[model samples]
Target chain A: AMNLKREQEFVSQYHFDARNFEWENENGAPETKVDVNFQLLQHDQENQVTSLIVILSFMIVFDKFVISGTISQVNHIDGRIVNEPSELNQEEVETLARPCLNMLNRLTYEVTEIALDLPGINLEF
Target chain B: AMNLKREQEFVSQYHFDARNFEWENENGAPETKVDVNFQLLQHDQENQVTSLIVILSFMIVFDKFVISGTISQVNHIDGRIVNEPSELNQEEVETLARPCLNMLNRLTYEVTEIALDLPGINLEF
Candidate 1:
């Protein structure tokens, strides 16, 4: 906790465009989808400073009801606070993507419970 | 991985009624509020089936920008799936309350980044 200073201005954008509940088919046990996209914002190979953006998209669909959202944030690493990601590996991306994913699950459960008119949806991904 | 089954219908309600951004004085590093409330829903001595409701409320206020929400869900524990929580201990309570807290932090950051309009609030408690 004392070795590094993690102060990267992470620009976040959340787009929850879909909130539909029909329950038409009445089949399938809540299909959950989670995916992430990473984009390069800034990278200085000389100073080993790297900045990247992470966009995570998630969805939970049961029968005919569906709720989906996207969370996008930035990861700033300057070689000292964190490792230099010239080629950001899957592990690093996953670690960075965890928080965004957390927000997705949180919002999905929140909206689903209200839209579906049930007890809180205990949906975790 | 399939020893126990956890199928408790948790009733969750998220009331994000506040999205106030006055930025009046501007003097704090995002005040984060996280609290939990536990209530006994059902406790059967014969069946050893215990059910309790956990309500978690969280807020993050930086200067005047504040975003807050609450998550209330039921924790259904039986002797079979989990220990009979006649008296839910701090450890047990914390374990059950973690997901609710996660949801709070998730919402706070999501709203703050948008309402405050700088970046995702990295306020975690």
Candidate 2:
């Protein structure tokens, strides 16, 4: 298989309060600003797959509301390939890094919808 | 469709353990410190972008030897533009976030060499 040998896993623990956002944006609170805290748990190099355990704390700042959720998923990256040091290239590095990019893209959207049914908070993207 | 008005969602079957991160560092962990939990579920302008699910558990000074692992991912986020708002700025935010920053700058080096060959522990980050 694809260098599954490079697989890694671990857990993280943290918290987020929406009030923190209020404290951060005391001036113009744009409709809603989410408060999120999570730990990244798995990183794989050879297979180019990274997985995480995410905790979504959705806060409807204006509505004084909070909703939460969780999700676990893997992102598959595209681009270059991973090869031995003797045959490595810039493009290969790019490819190796693409999975992380995909993971980020996927994660960004999933965390935002914890309060999918709350007012003030919207799940647009 | 801009103002879909308001909506909300909740669950009784979810684990705050996988979605939130609480300092595994407490004792009877006295006052002056509040156990705070967080998760920024989503950020939507026209569409939602940035999502994450997290977990934070209390350790209460139990930093012994815990390599916990789990699957909790997708804690969303938002920003100014991006229409979809998965727009996380690199100024105070790296598209990948804290871990990304640490790994990118080689800051995670000394502490993250799980000695894959020796097969110690598979880490998450």
Candidate 3:
């Protein structure tokens, strides 16, 4: 049984934005879509920690209504053996990203539900 | 266009635990299962912000092999209209949870991949 020590969690940066526009008649009903991206905001091998940001955005367009918003969150993880050269391999990278991605997926599901409640937006997935 | 001001990102608490046990043959191969839970760690309406924690855990057992782990993370969100009495409704709650949940989902996927790399462990889906 190896004792894995958790160092500290860092406060990372995130951004979220939403926009709504008047729906146009020519385009008909726009297709509903969601896009998500992940970026490595920062990393500190000496401290055995890394910070990542998840950006989630979606767009919905309808007759006389358009709505869009983005949600971003930062997550940090620490536990790799910093001194070992092999510590930064694919396995280590995945280990560090696991928790962050899991949280992001949950948040997206919740937001999508809320978004569907908008006055003129209806999405089914 | 309302400007949503992001107050500040706070460093929250998280915990991850993994344990392996010696396989006992009499019981036959154990079942593989995963469980996830979310908790509100802290919230400050006066400051227009809230913090949440996600807990993810899984267990897998097989002949001569057993593995289990827990991943925990804290996420914060701000920009709520604190003065408004009707601000903390279901929609607001879902909005606050969206980013955190999304990140957790991503991390879980990444970790599960790494966990599968362990010797004598196999997981699908």
Candidate 4:
């Protein structure tokens, strides 16, 4: 039998929104662009546990089409106490946040695809 | 010259979360599981504008590893007045929400990858 200890593995909260969207035609050619912003908030440690709040803003600008949105999520994990390393280390911290970032990337791609599918856009993905 | 009218392309808010994580070893083998929850709140119409609140949960349970989290976000969009279709139609509603769903899918994949990368997990992608 394998020995395994269990802890917490759940996000407590999150937020996302669209900040801005703009697009136009330049030189009779279609142009597209996307801008995204993200923020991470670390809460004070308590009982060797710390919470994180992440905020994101995603935007997509295409010729004659535009899409913008924002996102936020909260997470809690083992936090270092005093000089001792917590259950999770710095690398783990980044590992935990990677999923959120990937999500944003996918969101941007999907929004862009949808905008391109617009009747007038008529672009291929 | 192309005439393009502008309105709103910004998401006011959004949310995502992870509800559960579990893993186990059965018959000298490993098993993993994850659970997620999501919610969407549509606010009352005000001045032909409506707000949306989206909540999502993402989880990944890897052999010897488990991860779970939650997310929340809010958004405002032009709402239909009376029986008339607003600037956005039923299809647009689904289109707008599609990006959020795609983000969640990506989040799940990334988290699973990170968990698999754990020293003990040692699983290949």
Which tens-of-lDDT digit does each residue in A1-125 have in candidate 4?
21112223322323233332331233343334332222334435555644554343444444333334333445544543323214445555445545555555554454333323333222221
| lDDT at B111, model 4 | 35
Ranked by lDDT from best down, the candidates are 1, 3, 4, 2
Off by over 4 Å in 4: A1-46, A81-96, A118-125, B1-125
Please write out the lDDT profile of model 2 over residues A1-125, one tens digit for every residue: 12322222222221222333555577754344333222445455675644433223332333432323222222222232323222535453334334333333333233323322223223432
Candidate 2: where are CA atoms >4 Å away?
Answer: A1-4, A9-21, A25-94, A117-125, B1-125
B33-108, model 1: which lDDT tens digit per residue? 7677767776667776666777776654445444544566676666633334445567766777766665555555
Question: Model 4 over residues B39-122: C-alpha lDDT tens digits?
Answer: 324435555644444343444444333333333345445543323224445555445444545544544454344323323322
Best by lDDT: 1
Q: Each model's C-alpha lDDT?
A: 0.54, 0.30, 0.41, 0.38
* Candidate 4 all-Cα RMSD: 17.0
- What is the Å distance of residue B93 in model 2 from its true position? 39
Task: List TM-score (chain A only) for every prediction.
Answer: 0.63, 0.27, 0.41, 0.41
Which whole-number lDDT from 0 to 100 does residue A52 have in model 2?
32
lDDT tens digits, residues B1-125, model 3?
Answer: 21233222211211122322333345545577755445655567687665555454555543433334443445455644344323456554444444434443443343333333333222432
lDDT of 1 by residue, A32-75 (tens): 77777766677667877666777776665555445545556676
Poorly placed runs, candidate 1 (over 4 Å): A1-125, B1-32, B80-87
Best by DockQ: 4
TM-score of each: 0.39, 0.23, 0.26, 0.28
DockQ scores of the candidates = 0.03, 0.03, 0.02, 0.21
Pick the TM-score winner: 1
